C-alpha cells in the first residue's frame, strides 16, 4: 500500500523478486542506476528483474516548507542519538567495572566466612 | 514540461536521502534500547551484590568480635 | 523493611560513594522561522496588484477545486478502518510481552 | 483489495514473484499444491517464492 523508500502511496508500484517489497517505480529505478542492488536486503537486482493560483502559490510553498523543516529537525534527531549513544555505552561500561569490582568483593567476603569456621 | 521533470528528479534524491537517514535512525536508536535495558539490568547486579557484601561484613565482624 | 533496611543500606552504599543540524539545533532555543504573512491581509487601496492576482484569485480557484466532497466521508472512514487494524496489533504485543514477563518471574519464584 | 483467483476480499494476501498479483494465501497455496505454477502466467512458482 506504501512505497518502501520515500514513504509514498505509489502510482505505479513494482515488486522485486529477490526481496518481496513494493516500491514506486521511479524510486527503485533510481537506486538500481546508483548501485545495482536491492536497497533493503543488499542483494543483486537489476531493472529487468523488477515486476493554478493556490496550487502555484499556497500549496507548493507549504510542500517545500514541510520538506525543509522536517529534514532539518530529522537531522537534529540523528545528532542527539550520536550525541549520547555515547552516554549509554559509557554508563554501561561504568556498570561493568562495578560488577567486576563487586565480583571480587562478594566471593571473598563469602570465602572469609568459610575460613572463619576454622 | 522539463521544469516538472526537473522537480521530479530532485524529489527522487529527497526520497533516497530520507531512507538512508531513517535506517540509521532506527538502527542506531535500536542499539540505544538494548543498552538501556541491559544497563538497568546490569544495575540490578550491583543492588544484589551490594547487600550480600554488606551481609558478609556484619557476620564476620560479630563473629571475629566474639 | 520497605522503610528501614533500604534506608540503612542506602547510607552504607552512600558512604562507599563518599570514599570513591546547525539551523535545526539553533531554532531549538525556542523560535520558529517566520513564514509569508502576506496572502491573507492585502488591501484594495494598498500598494500591490500581484497580491490580488499573484496571491488570492488563483489560490482561491485551486482551493474551490481542492475543497471537496465528491468522495466525502467514504475516503475518511476507509482510513479510520486502517487505524483500527494498526491499533489492535500493538495490544497483541502488549500481551505477548505480558505473558513472557510473568513467565520469567514464575520460574524465579520456584 | 481483491483476490484474482476467487474474486473475494483476501484475509491473508501474499504476492507472487513471477506474475505480480495479490493472491489469498489459502487459495494460492492450494493452487501450488495442485501444480507448482502461478495461475495467471503459468510460470513456475513455489510456496517459498510467494511472499
From Swiss-Prot, chain B:
It is found in: Nucleus. Residues 1-66 are annotated as: Required for self-association. Present with 11700 molecules/cell in log phase SD medium. Homotetramer. Component of the NTC complex (or PRP19-associated complex), composed of at least CEF1, CLF1, ISY1, NTC20, SNT309, SYF1, SYF2, and PRP19. It comes from Saccharomyces cerevisiae (strain ATCC 204508 / S288c). Probable ubiquitin-protein ligase involved in pre-mRNA splicing. Acts as a central component of the NTC complex (or PRP19-associated complex) that associates to the spliceosome to mediate conformational rearrangement or to stabilize the structure of the spliceosome after U4 snRNA dissociation, which leads to spliceosome maturation. It is also probably involved in DNA repair. Belongs to the WD repeat PRP19 family. Residues 1-57 are annotated as: Interaction with CEF1. This is Pre-mRNA-processing factor 19. The chain holds residues 78 to 143 of 503 of the full protein. Transmembrane segments: none annotated.
Curated annotation (Swiss-Prot), chain C:
Involved in pre-mRNA splicing by stabilizing the NTC (or PRP19-associated complex). As a component of the NTC complex, associates to the spliceosome to mediate conformational rearrangement or to stabilize the structure of the spliceosome after U4 snRNA dissociation, which leads to spliceosome maturation. GO terms for biological process: mRNA splicing, via spliceosome. Signal peptide: none annotated. The keyword Transport does not apply. Keywords: mRNA processing, mRNA splicing, Nucleus, Spliceosome. The gene is SNT309. Present with 721 molecules/cell in log phase SD medium. Belongs to the NTC complex (or PRP19-associated complex), composed of at least CEF1, CLF1, ISY1, NTC20, SNT309, SYF1, SYF2, and PRP19. GO terms for cellular component: Prp19 complex; U2-type catalytic step 1 spliceosome. It is found in: Nucleus. This is Pre-mRNA-splicing factor SNT309.
UniProtKB/Swiss-Prot annotation, chain D:
It is found in: Nucleus. Residues 1-51 form the U-box domain. Present with 11700 molecules/cell in log phase SD medium. Belongs to the WD repeat PRP19 family. Homotetramer. Component of the NTC complex (or PRP19-associated complex), composed of at least CEF1, CLF1, ISY1, NTC20, SNT309, SYF1, SYF2, and PRP19. Probable ubiquitin-protein ligase involved in pre-mRNA splicing. Acts as a central component of the NTC complex (or PRP19-associated complex) that associates to the spliceosome to mediate conformational rearrangement or to stabilize the structure of the spliceosome after U4 snRNA dissociation, which leads to spliceosome maturation. It is also probably involved in DNA repair. This is Pre-mRNA-processing factor 19. The gene is PRP19. The chain holds residues 1 to 51 of 503 of the full protein.
